[PDB]
Structure 1
Amino acid sequence: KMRKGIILAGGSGTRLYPVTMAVSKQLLPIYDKPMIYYPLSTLMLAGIRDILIISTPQDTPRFQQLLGDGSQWGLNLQYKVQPSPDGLAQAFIIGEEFIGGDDCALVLGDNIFYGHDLPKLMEAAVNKESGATVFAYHVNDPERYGVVEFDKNGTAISLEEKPLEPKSNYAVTGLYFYDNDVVQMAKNLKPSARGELEITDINRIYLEQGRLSVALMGRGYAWLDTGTHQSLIEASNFIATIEERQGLKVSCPEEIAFRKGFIDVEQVRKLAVPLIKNNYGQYLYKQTKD
């Protein structure tokens, strides 16, 4: 088997109106590049080159307009519409045909992960033969999330979606790794009381079966909040501060494709020339020099 990726970049957008009446949430800038460049880079860093992008009926075509078939970066990008935002777990029903019999990795379109040795963090998950792998990260508002409860020995024992009384402060991040089992699982799921096909219910099945690995994502990593306008600004500020300090970009898909060998120096130069008059294009071009 191989592992195909799915970025779920849909959603009603209501939380951010009227900004998101104008622009899809996942095309909003996080400093110097559209939001979706970040989770796209996460999947690339995991070695995943074949990726299905799912958005809404109005928005999906705008992603396709930005990114194309991903061939310029050594990827294959495909697109599919989620008719209505009826649950994260619908991603697997929509991507049925795409996933075929392979393993997959689903990342939410608004999830931004930063930190040292991220690829090594994911490695085990990526490598996994069977089961599912999720990431737990300590937050101050776990009631917004899927919350994973750990026993006194550091074993996951329960998962609850947006509980009014959280059993802990560990949230389940928006990056998930699964074996080929998830599709049929999702296909057989029933909607929660709130009317959604829940990823948390998928994860609970793997747990219940003993097949769920819950990897801790330490405080040394940043998992940026993009839920509110204010948190968007902070995420932008955070990335700007890193980049302007380093002179390097965070989650620049061209850079990652080049450094991983998806594309070569000649391809980078071909990408950069047309863009040579803007700072983004100069960064690309500098990367081929030294």
Structure 2
Amino acid sequence: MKTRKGIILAGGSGTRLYPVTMAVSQQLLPIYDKPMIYYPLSTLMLAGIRDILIISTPQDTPRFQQLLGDGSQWGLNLQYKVQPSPDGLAQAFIIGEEFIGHDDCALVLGDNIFYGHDLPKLMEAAVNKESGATVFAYHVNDPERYGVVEFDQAGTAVSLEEKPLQPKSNYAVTGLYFYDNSVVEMAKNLKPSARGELEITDINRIYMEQGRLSVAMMGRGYAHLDTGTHQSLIEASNFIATIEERQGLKVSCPEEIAFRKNFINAQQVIELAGPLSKNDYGKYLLKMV
């Protein structure tokens, strides 16, 4: 029993993306060749996670369910739940309390795109840590926007601040977290912040003080993207297009990852790629086996 359950928090309205998000849900927007939701979903599968709860707005939840179903086609077990109002990342564990039960869990933001040659290994370690938590961070130019993590002369994380007026560093904690079961009771005791939200940073600070928090780095060989603005969104799509078209590889293709993790076998892949063989998406899969 380890981090066998995951949650994808895909709520919000994406107002900064208007008018593109007036007709399409942000997490359904394409990132080159696939819907945005495929990326965070692929991140959890890479960690060996099959039981995944997707939390979204009452309007967008059914659209994700139509696209993905129960995930059985990829050897997954997808569930869904609505978030009435975006009260904060931490509320994910409140809404997913029954789903999580007594197991470990992982949380990823539905609009964060992760990629890196060593990503699988990086998360393998996070999954094998049954007590405590693991967060990920990387350098940015606008730390005041995200949760910040400060290290010491050695290289240990000693502080965390949610959007500090004067950041202690430029290392922001990304939207990917791995917790043990104690995270549920933590979120239930949290109180609203200055902005009236249950902060994920308040939970991570506790694991830190207990000395049970790992802070893995997503630097040097990792992709650092943002889907928040029209400009950042297209940059993200260009990144994916560039690596897929120039290096001949697929990034966050759930059918491929499901095969690699042995969620589905070769026969199943061919069955899935059959109907999709009209474009290179299905052809790549047919070549894979």
Q: TM-score by structure 2 length?
A: 0.96
Q: Please give the root-mean-square deviation of Cα atoms over the aligned residues, in Å.
A: 1.1
Q: Is the 8 A contact 2:3 2:127 kept in 1?
A: no
- Deviation readout 1:128-180 (Å, 9 max, x if unpaired): 02011101111111111000011222121111111121110000011100000
SS in 2 for 1:196: coil
Q: CA deviation at 1:246?
A: 2.3
Structure 1 distance, partners of 2:130, 2:115, is 26
Aligned to 1:275: 276
Q: Is the 8 A contact 1:111 1:223 kept in 2?
A: no
Q: Is the 8 A contact 1:12 1:85 kept in 2?
A: no
- Deviation readout 1:21-52 (Å, 9 max, x if unpaired): 21111111000000111111111111011111
Which stretch shifts more, 158-167 or 63-72? 158-167
- Cα distance change, pair 135–2 in 1 and its aligned pair in 2 (3 A): closer
Q: Give the 4+ runs in structure 1 shifted more than 4 A.
A: none
Q: CA deviation at 1:208?
A: 1.8
Aligned to 1:28: 29
Q: Is the 8 A contact 2:3 2:179 kept in 1?
A: no
1:211-250 counterparts in 2 under 5 A?
A: 211-250=212-251
Q: Which runs of 5+ in 2 are unaligned?
A: none
Equivalent pairs, count: 286
Q: Is the 8 A contact 2:108 2:175 kept in 1?
A: yes
- Cα distance change, pair 188–233 in 1 and its aligned pair in 2 (3 A): same
| Aligned sequence identity (%) | 92
Structure 1 distance, partners of 2:243, 2:172, is 25
Q: Is the 8 A contact 1:89 1:186 kept in 2?
A: yes
Structure 2 distance, partners of 1:278, 1:118, is 27
Q: Is the 8 A contact 1:46 1:126 kept in 2?
A: yes
Which stretch shifts more, 259-268 or 88-97? 259-268
Structure 2 distance, partners of 1:113, 1:2, is 19
Which stretch shifts more, 35-44 or 265-274? 265-274
SS in 2 for 1:166: coil
Q: CA deviation at 1:278?
A: 2.8
1:82-121 counterparts in 2 under 5 A?
A: 82-121=83-122
Q: Is the 8 A contact 1:138 1:219 kept in 2?
A: no
SS in 2 for 1:102: coil
Q: Is the 8 A contact 2:3 2:178 kept in 1?
A: no
SS in 1 for 2:164: coil
Q: Which runs of 5+ in 1 are unaligned?
A: none
Structure 2 distance, partners of 1:145, 1:134, is 13
Aligned to 2:66: 65
Q: CA deviation at 1:285?
A: 2.0
